[PDB]
């Protein structure tokens, strides 16, 4: 009787072309989402993003969907995302890590620089021992996956 949350997390990046400057070659957004875009705030209370020290206010707290930070700049670096859950879900938070990408890597064939860069990780948060009240609040929520019920027949 476990509850799990399929998620996707990573970033999208857009090269600015003739609008690119030394300060800002790309606009990007880093995010954690439901893998099928359902509302994971059924479990996620807030997400804390840690950006590089070169940004103003490098620790951002996003309390409401969408759980994303949108920024622009010139460089790639590691982003920490700490997921804090509602109190009936889990008293421990979960940290995720994502290397921000502004260019596509590992690419055959010809590319164009204006193509949006999407680099994201597909994953699933498992809560192994859900309380009975947590179950009653979120049962069969579209963002969650539940154990298939054995046939009584």
């Amino acid at each position: 009787i476990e509850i799990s949350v399929p998620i996707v997390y990573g970033n999208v990046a857009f090269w600015l072309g003739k609008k690119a400057s030394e300060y800002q070659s790309h606009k990007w957004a880093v995010y954690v989402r439901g893998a099928t875009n359902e509302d994971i705030s059924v479990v996620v209370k807030k997400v804390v993003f840690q950006l590089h020290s070169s940004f103003n206010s490098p620790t951002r707290v996003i309390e409401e969907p969408p759980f994303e930070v949108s920024e622009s700049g010139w460089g790639e670096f590691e982003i920490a995302m700490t997921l804090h859950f509602h109190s009936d879900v889990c008293d421990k938070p979960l940290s995720l890590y994502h290397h921000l990408k502004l260019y596509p890597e590992d690419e055959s064939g010809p590319l164009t620089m204006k193509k949006p860069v999407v680099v994201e990780s597909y994953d699933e948060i498992v809560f192994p021992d859900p309380s009975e009240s947590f179950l009653a609040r979120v049962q069969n929520h579209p963002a969650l996956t539940f154990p298939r019920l054995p046939s009584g027949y």
């Binding site: 590089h52 020290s53 070169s54 460089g75 790639e76 670096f77 590691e78 260019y103």
Partner: peptide, 6 residues
Amino acid sequence: ARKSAP
């Protein structure tokens, strides 16, 4: 932390 242009 490390930060570099691609």
